[PDB]
């Protein structure tokens, strides 16, 4: 009659591509974990006292335990050196940079230009403002990493600006998919 | 907690009893690869181009749900445990691309801390239900075991057109809808 929730997942942890690999598998029930296996452990442990005989029950079947250990090479290492190498690893999306500003209605009045950067992948990106060829960092406010949910990322930046005559404000952005650093400017 | 270069979550089995609610999905680096349909016996990809360059056996994904069903079946009788209190979700409405009046855009409704993952997500164009261009994506998981989902909506922005995102959740004492307008900007 009442409600309950169960969850299973398998996590492949990669470092430097294929040099050091780690395979961990969780067993979640009711937003709680009770049995876990780690490639650095070599067997099934018990996160809670509930799955203590369960972990040893799966530690009592030697044929099944080796398939799990071999799954580090069959599931994790093969997919990284296979599908992902042919799909996700070779996926690059360039960001879209736009400069806008709200709350301004008069000339030479304090405000904070907004540099908006959306639809980019992967997430290894940084953004820096540039006034007249000088990287600005004082009074800078920016959104955090906003996952677009469709194989893209977005993030916005705002710089508290004073409308000085003879001004060149540039939103400089560098990215690995961006073979060249993109610079979008704005003036009075 | 733990760090790595990249992490791909292959195999996401979730079961909810009663009602026999299941879901199988693949994921990588905070991003879904594809999901296997339960009853139509097919593998649906979030992006089609990766389905043209890779194929997954949907039978293996169903064996996961079948064992998990057997898993939860033994675990619900093994313990007299009480249900987890239904967490109240929190949402955020945002556009995919910058707002441009008269230009097509995709309005997204991201909702985090969804627990249990049983919730209707709908839109209201000027307090009127519109089901055109609605993409209901599969749930996601984060390392606190809560879940987050996304929903998309294509539209034409205008000052006289106000939009919002409706939420129908179990733990909510009442349905909540955060109203966003490009007219405010």
């Amino acid at each position: 009659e009442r409600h309950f929730v169960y969850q299973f997942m398998g996590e492949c942890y990669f470092t430097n591509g294929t040099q050091r690999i780690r395979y961990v598998t969780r067993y979640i029930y009711n937003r709680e974990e009770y049995v876990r296996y780690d490639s650095d452990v070599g067997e099934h442990r018990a996160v809670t006292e509930l799955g203590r005989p369960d972990a040893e029950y799966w530690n009592s079947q030697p044929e099944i335990l080796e398939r799990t250990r071999a799954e580090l090479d069959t599931v994790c290492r093969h997919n990284y050196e296979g599908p992902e190498t042919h799909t996700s690893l070779r996926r690059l999306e360039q960001p879209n940079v736009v400069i806008s500003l709200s709350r301004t209605e008069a000339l030479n009045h304090h405000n904070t230009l907004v540099c908006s950067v959306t639809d980019f992948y992967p997430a290894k990106i940084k953004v820096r403002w540039f006034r007249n060829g000088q990287e600005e960092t004082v009074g800078v406010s920016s959104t955090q990493l906003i996952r677009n949910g469709d194989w893209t990322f977005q993030v916005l930046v705002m710089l508290e600006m004073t409308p000085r005559r003879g001004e060149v404000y540039t939103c400089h952005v560098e990215h690995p998919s961006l073979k060249s650093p993109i610079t979008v400017e704005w003036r009075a | 907690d733990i760090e790595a270069d990249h992490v791909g979550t292959y195999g996401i089995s979730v079961y909810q009893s009663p009602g026999d609610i299941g879901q199988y999905t693949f994921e990588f680096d905070g991003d879904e690869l594809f999901y296997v349909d339960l009853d139509k016996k097919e593998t649906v990809w979030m992006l089609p181009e990766f389905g043209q360059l890779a194929s997954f056996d949907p039978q293996g994904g169903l064996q996961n749900i079948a064992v998990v069903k057997h898993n939860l079946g033994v675990l619900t009788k093994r313990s007299n445990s009480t249900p987890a209190t239904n967490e109240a979700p929190q949402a955020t409405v945002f556009p995919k691309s910058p707002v441009l009046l008269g230009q097509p855009n995709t309005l997204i409704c991201f909702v985090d801390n969804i627990f249990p993952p049983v919730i209707n997500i709908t839109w209201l164009r000027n307090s009127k239900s519109v089901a055109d261009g609605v993409y209901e994506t599969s749930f996601f998981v984060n390392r606190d075991y809560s879940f987050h989902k996304l929903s998309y909506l294509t539209f034409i922005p205008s000052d006289d057109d106000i939009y919002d995102c409706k939420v129908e959740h179990w733990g909510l004492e009442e349905p909540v809808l955060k109203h966003w307008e490009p007219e405010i900007p």
Binding site: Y57, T68, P83 | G11, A54, S55
Partner: peptide, 15 residues
């Protein structure tokens, strides 16, 4: 051609 994606295999505790 293409390359298939191998999944993670779960386990089944006894009754």
């Amino acid at each position: 051609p293409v390359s298939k994606m191998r999944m993670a295999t779960p386990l089944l505790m006894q009754a």
